[PDB]
Scaffold this active site. Structure first.
Site, PDB file in Angstrom:
ATOM      1  N   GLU A 378       0.823  -1.186   0.000  1.00  0.00           N
ATOM      2  CA  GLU A 378       0.000   0.000   0.000  1.00  0.00           C
ATOM      3  C   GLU A 378       0.862   1.243   0.000  1.00  0.00           C
ATOM      4  OE1 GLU A 378      -2.080  -1.050   3.568  1.00  0.00           O
ATOM      5  OE2 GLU A 378      -3.635  -2.150   2.435  1.00  0.00           O
ATOM      6  N   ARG A 394       4.098   1.271   2.299  1.00  0.00           N
ATOM      7  CA  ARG A 394       4.088   0.150   3.240  1.00  0.00           C
ATOM      8  C   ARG A 394       5.130  -0.881   2.819  1.00  0.00           C
ATOM      9  NH1 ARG A 394      -1.397  -2.882   5.471  1.00  0.00           N
ATOM     10  NH2 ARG A 394      -0.510  -4.962   5.873  1.00  0.00           N
ATOM     11  N   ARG A 458      -1.820  -1.308  16.063  1.00  0.00           N
ATOM     12  CA  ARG A 458      -2.355  -0.147  15.360  1.00  0.00           C
ATOM     13  C   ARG A 458      -3.033   0.711  16.382  1.00  0.00           C
ATOM     14  NH1 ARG A 458      -4.309  -3.087   9.847  1.00  0.00           N
ATOM     15  NH2 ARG A 458      -2.140  -3.715   9.235  1.00  0.00           N
TER      16      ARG A 458
END
Ligand SMILES: [K+]
Ligand SMILES: [K+]
Lengths: 523, 523
Positions: A378, A394, A458
């Site tokens: 990504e 990413r 995250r």
């Protein structure tokens, strides 16, 4: 020896439409204490109390004995962001409302009158905003006193001073419009100032393609304060006679063509593949029976209506690639009018690589040259200088974003000095935008970046700014929006010349929107 | 294998109230085949067609290419047993209804008219019963022909011949009455023939104590055909001022005092303990602030109303134990009138041990002597010979039930010859009941046992019968009820002299009831 009341102030979005939001957590290990009588809260002198609907005090009981000494401040999550239809209010089986003040003044005395468990006791303060509160509202407050057994208790605050609590809008909550989950945000601003937020509508569960997934779109004409009824720019239903769950389309990316105000949404349509993940179920080939299809929908009326899908796979996919798709989030219009979407492909060696796809004819035809870096997925692209594209990626090697630039639309790439150093990540999507001096109130070219500012998990979704073309990301030029755990994806835009907007997967709602004054980020 | 239609017939309960039930699964890897046209299904001549509402043919698309060699018969689970409010009908995103026959005759013609994917294609046949169907309904059927490209296709059936499909009732479905889940069945028959089924009402999730859990009860006065509105014999709400989720009560066991028809439900009330598992959060002591409480509710009106809780912890718990609770499921009345509940306790070394508690005075006082075997947990007890109690136990050593008997109410125990040999298990709850000759139609003393008949996973729920006090469980004396995956707990009772009842966690509903003629088990 006296018992101490421990205080942890949260740093998470206060959703305007929520009935509860966790503001403070209190923990008291009652060895001598028999009763917590009241909590005194004082809001900052600059807080607009007219935007606040209620302040509440909850009791949430005790802790398992084996967890004593681990510094927990709650026994359980108080407010779900996942249970369909049950994400707006505190779960009442976890928290007992001891008292509440509606339309409070700056000083709030919350009556608890709570006999304490002989051991750990958890309490928390809920803040509820009025439905019409401004998105630029900041709330600050201090717990001034906690009265225990008719005396002022010793306090210890573990969280930092000067927390500014920001509000937000849960644009999509789990369960809305019959969908279990929403994921993968993209966000752009039309030339008319309209906000267009796109995402996966994951009807059956939160799992990735393949599944029953549409691309949804929320449109706002008032700076993100209110959002129109969800639209579905891309949806394939029972195309080809296969079930809808074998016709998902997702990982959207949105761009606004600034020359015409036409908006483009690109996504991956996966056909077949049983109920397995597209990432390893798309194969070499060109048709829908073998490989994911790259599809566009466009809007020529400021995002109100959307074209039938335009399948561009045959323009840009190499037959030997397993999977070509957009980098989720957004694309751009370059100064010279070129449209650019980041993309990623799993090549014939089964390795993913990020790059860019561009159109020089207003989106009629598209081209990809060479990947920027191996084993990357990504990515987001920004025109950091005129004719210079920066791809921020990413990287499967872990720990940090890769960064490269191209001056020839991806024929050749140059590793950027910030690459694999400056921006730590947990291997997750990240947003990057460039905002030119002419278009913002600071009169400086700036880069803005958002991701989970961590290398594991995250959490700590943070907006970072760079004033030197991404060479340095100074700590003072950052705003941490969400310390909680979430799915981590985010997308940035400029709401106007003074204000940043972010649409992201937060700890409080599947699709969370916040507005941040640029001068709060760069002071 | 190409262009052969593979068929797998299910062996799972057909729920009378479901709109769909999976009856046959079909797989066709289409190399030369272009369309599947017509499927002919013939019900057995003994089937009562008047009890069947419809038969449907669904198309469920294709498979991921990496799975073509795995010989799956579906791409996904077609009908949820977990999604609240969505457990009655096929998920329409997974399955497209191609054909349906209402009020079918014995011969059913289904017209798919389905163009085939170039690769694997999945179809399935759904059976829908009429609401008033008999619980002793048995359904058999054969797929006679499948026409592909207007010709009869080659067929290969991988499942055995002469499958008798049994119906069942989903007494509780996920989501019913606001509860996410229901678990841990107990079942007994009152002297009036009334069925009383108890279970955990797990409001927030399927997780074990500690959590927001009540003991629920479903009452049937017509042999299990219909069930009265759920009752809650034990529920502690915000007792002691703690949240409801820190006041769970569960793992119920039910017994009927046959001398008086008073019904007793025993359960474990856990107070405090944060949101952690009671198994690891209950500690030595006697008070609710430290240890799980053993509580009873009784009914003296055939299960219609229930007493306030009776806390008997002080009679039977050794203070040094971490945790004392009942063995979930049921207890018994011995021929001499003694009431017996199986129990389990975690001793001071934190090892669990199974045993029994009994009352010689109609439930006024209770007593526990010694454990039957170390490192055992859930157990059920039956009077296998007069004055001889057999305890059948979940054994943490794995693979098989432990079995012991006592002639002195648990002062001393003798390992049974069947122990750790005769009854395989995956380490899971199991039901055991004893039925005296005078109380059943065969005029033979029998034992009946139910569990997941496997050493791995929880599936193939099976009722087994023994004629020699549990020494031998002959293969011909067994009925397999559910080949699907579920949570595995079950509990048996005699509905009447000719009919066995079972309440269990099945692959099709959280609380599934079936009635089975005894002569189907021991023919
Ligand atoms: K400017
Ligand atoms: K007592």
């Amino acid at each position: 020896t006296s018992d101490t009341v421990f205080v942890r102030e949260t740093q998470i979005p206060i959703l305007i439409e929520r009935q509860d939001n966790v503001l403070f957590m209190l923990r008291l290990n009652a060895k001598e204490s028999r009763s917590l009588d009241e909590v005194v809260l004082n809001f900052g002198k600059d807080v607009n109390m007219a935007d606040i609907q209620s302040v509440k005090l909850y009791y949430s009981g005790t802790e398992a004995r084996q967890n004593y000494g681990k510094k927990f401040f709650t026994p359980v999550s108080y407010i779900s962001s996942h249970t369909p239809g049950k994400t707006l209010a505190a779960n009442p089986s976890y928290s007992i409302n001891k008292s509440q003040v509606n339309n409070p003044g700056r000083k709030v005395i919350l009556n608890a009158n709570q006999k304490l468990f002989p051991g750990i006791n958890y309490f928390w303060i809920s803040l509820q905003m009025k439905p019409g509160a401004s998105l630029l509202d900041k709330v600050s407050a201090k717990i001034v006193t906690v009265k225990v057994d008719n005396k002022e208790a010793l306090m210890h605050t573990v969280s930092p001073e000067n927390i500014a609590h920001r509000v937000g809008v849960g644009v999509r909550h789990a369960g809305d419009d019959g969908s279990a989950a929403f994921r993968i945000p993209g966000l752009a601003t039309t030339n008319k100032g309209t906000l267009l937020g796109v995402y996966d509508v994951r009807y059956n569960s939160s799992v990735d393609l393949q599944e029953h997934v549409d691309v949804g779109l929320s449109r706002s004409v008032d700076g993100g304060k209110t959002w129109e009824k969800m639209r579905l720019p891309l949806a394939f239903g029972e195309t080809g006679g296969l079930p809808a769950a074998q016709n998902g389309v997702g990982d959207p990316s949105i761009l606004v063509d600034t020359k015409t105000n036409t908006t483009w949404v690109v996504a991956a349509w996966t056909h077949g593949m049983g109920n397995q993940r597209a990432w390893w179920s798309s194969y070499p080939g060109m048709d829908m029976n073998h490989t994911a299809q790259l599809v566009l929908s466009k809007s020529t009326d400021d995002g109100k209506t959307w074209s039938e899908p335009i399948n561009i796979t045959d323009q840009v996919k190499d037959p030997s690639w397993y999977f070509l798709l957009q980098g989720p989030g957004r694309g751009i219009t370059m100064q010279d009018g070129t449209l650019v979407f980041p993309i990623q492909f799993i090549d014939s060696t089964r390795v993913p690589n990020a790059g860019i796809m561009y159109s020089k004819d207003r989106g009629e035809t598209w081209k990809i040259h060479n990947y920027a870096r191996t084993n990357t997925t990504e990515a987001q692209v920004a025109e950091v200088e005129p004719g210079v594209l920066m791809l921020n990626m990413r990287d499967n090697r872990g720990g940090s974003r890769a960064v490269a630039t191209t001056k020839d639309l991806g024929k050749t790439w140059t590793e950027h000095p910030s690459s694999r150093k400056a921006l730590q990540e947990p291997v997750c999507m990240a947003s990057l935008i460039s905002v030119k001096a002419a278009d913002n109130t600071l009169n400086k070219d700036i880069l803005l970046f958002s991701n989970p500012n961590t290398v594991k998990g995250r959490h700590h979704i943070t907006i970072k700014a760079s004033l030197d073309g991404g060479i340095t990301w100074l700590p003072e030029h950052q705003v941490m929006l969400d310390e909680g755990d979430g799915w981590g994806y985010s997308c940035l835009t400029m709401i106007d010349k003074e204000t940043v907007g972010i649409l992201y997967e937060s700890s409080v709602a599947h699709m969370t929107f916040q507005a941040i004054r640029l001068r709060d980020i760069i002071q």
